[PDB]
């Protein structure tokens, strides 16, 4: 019988489809002049509508790739899989929702890359004595957790410009420790020392040849070093089938963007790779510091897990920084960094436990809702993260996507991807807002009262000035008229008090009991 579609959209095909998912449009054009074209499909079949001329699109979630999740990351012919399905083609008509499930699993024995960023100001000298044997001691500890470990090295002090560095006397530019008995290296901003190597003894060999620097202020500019270690993939050597850890060790504050204006540096950091062939951050004295948002974005794009391994007196500060950069960890470092190995192992455990999802390239007309089927079967509505997992344990996520309105472009794409994992799920969204009968619309047709409107999908659609089944009469002087003859007798009411009179032609209003037709709306 009557429904929402019956009395909501009766003017166009797109208006019919936008009313509700259940609406259908009978674009059959042998139907009499004016009919319930827009209503449910079943009664359109009952209305003797042609089965081939019925516009009824059904939203669906079609999977395109469903490779099975891998059991071991050992052997790894670039074929380990951690997210299934991998590609899904989603087709959504407007004001409708579709749901699909994904399964994320942390494959056992996955290769790992560790890049050791180390602050190297003068108060960080004794640490250099308790790191000289980290390549051999970390290889033994992390051999049980993974079968392919690669380790690198870095350094940084601060920008070498104006009030940060000493420029007097002239003998202090060669070594800033002129006043002290000892001598230090000329001050640098960031120098890449050792690229990610499978050989482990190279870390010991290339860390015994280092030496400290000295700058004036207390904060040290390590955010520049983090950015340059992140965006220079080819120089650093980051793998693609591995877990990226960036162990960033410091014992003082850090410089943030706009803090470089004290040196005369106003150009914003653009987040590109500037480390040359001399292994030195070249644009150090010309570009500002990286802000928190840009640093987070570059960490996200390259799949880096950042570990602030900092001393006690500043731990709180970095904790409050770790709440603004998702995916990081904070660890407590001794004065002489005699416990950085255990810090690294525990932080790796904490990274590997949690599973968190993130959405990339999501457009403004789509909304998503997650239901985490975590351990056992206890769904946790609204949650897109699980904690307290192990190695090899799998979690499931149920996703529901809703669309508001008809998007301009019927071909978009976005990504559902666990944070820190290479593997991602790609959704290709197609919006079915336009029916096929609107493509062959014929304008200025004689079928719309001598080209006074467009004739598509079997219905005249005309603009201002005219209205009706075929845009017959004008409303310029239609209100004052003697064409009141819409009933058999003068004393009788118009349309039997059951419809509206338009230009001397009764149109029956909708009824919940059933359909109303007739010249004077006297039928049922």
């Amino acid at each position: 019988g009557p429904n929402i579609c019956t009395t909501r959209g009766v003017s166009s095909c797109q208006q019919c489809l936008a009313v509700s998912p259940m609406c259908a449009w009978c674009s059959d054009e042998a139907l009499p002049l004016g009919s319930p074209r827009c209503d449910l499909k079943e009664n359109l079949l009952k209305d003797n509508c042609a089965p081939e001329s019925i516009e009824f699109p059904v939203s669906e979630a079609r999977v395109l790739e469903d490779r099975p999740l891998s059991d071991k990351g050992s052997g790894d012919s670039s074929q380990v899989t951690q997210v299934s399905p991998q590609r899904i083609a989603l087709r959504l008509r407007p004001d409708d929702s579709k749901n699909f499930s994904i399964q994320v699993r942390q494959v056992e024995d996955y290769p790992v890359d560790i890049y050791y960023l180390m602050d190297l100001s003068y108060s960080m000298k004794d640490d250099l004595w308790s790191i000289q044997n980290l390549g051999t001691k970390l290889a033994t500890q992390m051999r049980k957790l993974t079968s392919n470990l690669r380790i690198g090295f870095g350094a940084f002090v601060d920008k070498p410009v104006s009030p940060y560095m000493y420029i007097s006397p002239p003998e202090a530019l060669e070594n800033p420790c002129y006043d002290m008995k000892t001598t230090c290296l000329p001050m640098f901003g960031y120098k890449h020392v050792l690229t990610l190597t499978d050989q482990v003894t190279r870390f010991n060999e290339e860390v015994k040849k280092q030496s400290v620097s000295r700058n004036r202020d207390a904060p040290e500019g390590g955010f520049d070093a983090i950015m340059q270690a992140t965006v220079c993939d080819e120089k650093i050597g980051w793998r693609n089938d591995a877990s990226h850890l960036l162990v960033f060790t410091t014992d003082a504050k850090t410089h943030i963007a706009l803090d470089g204006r004290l040196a005369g540096i106003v150009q914003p950091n653009d987040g590109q790779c500037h480390v040359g062939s001399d292994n030195h951050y070249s644009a150090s004295t010309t570009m500002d510091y990286p802000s928190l948002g840009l640093m987070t974005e570059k960490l996200s794009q390259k799949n880096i897990n950042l570990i602030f391994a900092v001393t006690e007196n500043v731990v709180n500060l970095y904790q409050n920084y770790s709440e603004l950069i998702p995916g990081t960890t904070v660890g407590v470092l001794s004065m002489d960094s005699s416990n950085v190995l255990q810090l690294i192992v525990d932080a790796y455990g904490k990274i590997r436990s949690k599973v968190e999802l993130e959405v990339r390239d999501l457009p403004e007309e789509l909304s998503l809702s997650f239901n985490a089927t975590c351990l056992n079967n206890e769904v946790i509505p609204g949650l897109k993260s699980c904690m307290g997992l192990k190695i090899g344990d799998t979690v499931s996520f149920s996703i529901e996507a809703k669309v508001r309105g008809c998007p301009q472009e019927k071909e978009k794409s976005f990504t559902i991807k666990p944070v820190g994992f290479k593997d991602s799920l790609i959704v290709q969204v197609t919006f079915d807002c336009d029916c096929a009968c609107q493509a062959q619309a014929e304008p200025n047709s004689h079928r719309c009262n001598n080209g006074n409107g467009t004739f598509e999908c079997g219905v005249c659609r005309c603009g201002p000035g005219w209205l009706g089944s075929q845009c017959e009469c004008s409303e310029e002087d239609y209100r004052p008229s003697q064409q009141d003859e819409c009933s058999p007798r003068e004393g009788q009411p118009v349309c039997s008090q059951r419809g509206e009179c338009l230009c001397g032609q009764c149109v029956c209003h909708s009824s919940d009991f059933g359909k109303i037709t007739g010249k004077y709306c006297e039928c049922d």
Epitope: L33, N449, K519
Partner: antibody
Framework: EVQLQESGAELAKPGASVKMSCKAS????????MHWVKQRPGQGLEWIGY????????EYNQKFKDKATLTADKSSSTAYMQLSSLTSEDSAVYYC??????????????????WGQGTSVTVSS | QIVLTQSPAIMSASPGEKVTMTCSAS?????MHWYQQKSGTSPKRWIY???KLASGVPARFSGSGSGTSYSLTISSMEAEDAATYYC?????????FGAGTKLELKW
């Protein structure tokens, strides 16, 4: 306008196919549709099919369906109808009728207008 | 499908007489058109929406009625109006034609 011209009589053996033509001269041949009406020799005018010349929307009649396929040629401005699987009971006169728009008698969509001369189809072996 | 039955199958009248034809529908059709086909098998159009004369029709033919039974009236019939008249409905979606009424002349 308006003149519709039909082809001459066709003799067909049972089980064959027929190629009816209706050549339209006048108006535009893209703003008025075309019907096909069968007339048995014992009275009784039967609606057959339908075609919009711009886009081939062929709505068919009471249990005709595959027994008549309608096509159009907008270049030569001519509407064709193909009868398939002929039987001895299909020996009647086939007309092609236009379709009044603009007014189209308020709601009764049908006005036809300008019928063709009528092509008698004779079926025998 | 709506079935249309024209009650008088064969008629005859003298020149200068009143003639009436009836086409009674089966499902309360709004509007009903009448086609005239002479001897020669080519039915023209004669009346549309059951009260309006198509161009070229004289001012003698009239149509009246509503609901389920319509009628066509001829006043002062000459020898030029002797054909078969068919009724069309097209308010359902079979457009069905009437069986037709034959009209003759008295002599």
């Amino acid at each position: 306008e308006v003149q519709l011209q039909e082809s001459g009589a066709e003799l067909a053996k049972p089980g064959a196919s027929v190629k009816m033509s209706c050549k339209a001269s006048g108006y535009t041949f893209t703003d008025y549709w075309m019907h096909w009406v069968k007339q048995r020799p014992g009275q009784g005018l039967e609606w057959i099919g339908y075609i919009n010349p711009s886009t081939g929307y062929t709505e068919y009649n009471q249990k005709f369906k595959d027994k008549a396929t309608l096509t159009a040629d907008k270049s030569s401005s001519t509407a064709y109808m193909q009868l398939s699987s002929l039987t001895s009971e299909d020996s009647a006169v086939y007309y092609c009728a236009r379709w009044r728009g603009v007014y189209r008698s308020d709601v009764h969509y049908y006005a036809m207008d300008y019928w063709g001369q009528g092509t008698s189809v004779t079926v025998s072996s | 499908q709506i079935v249309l039955t024209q009650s008088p199958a064969i008629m005859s009248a003298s020149p200068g007489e009143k003639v009436t034809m009836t086409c009674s529908a089966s499902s309360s059709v709004s509007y009903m058109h009448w086609y005239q086909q002479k001897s020669g098998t080519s039915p023209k159009r004669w009346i549309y929406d059951t009260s309006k004369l198509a161009s070229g029709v004289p001012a003698r033919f009239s149509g009246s009625g509503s609901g389920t039974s319509y009628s066509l009236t001829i006043s002062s019939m000459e020898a030029e109006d002797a054909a078969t008249y068919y009724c069309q409905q097209w308010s359902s979606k079979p457009p069905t034609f009437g069986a037709g009424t034959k009209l003759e002349l008295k002599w």
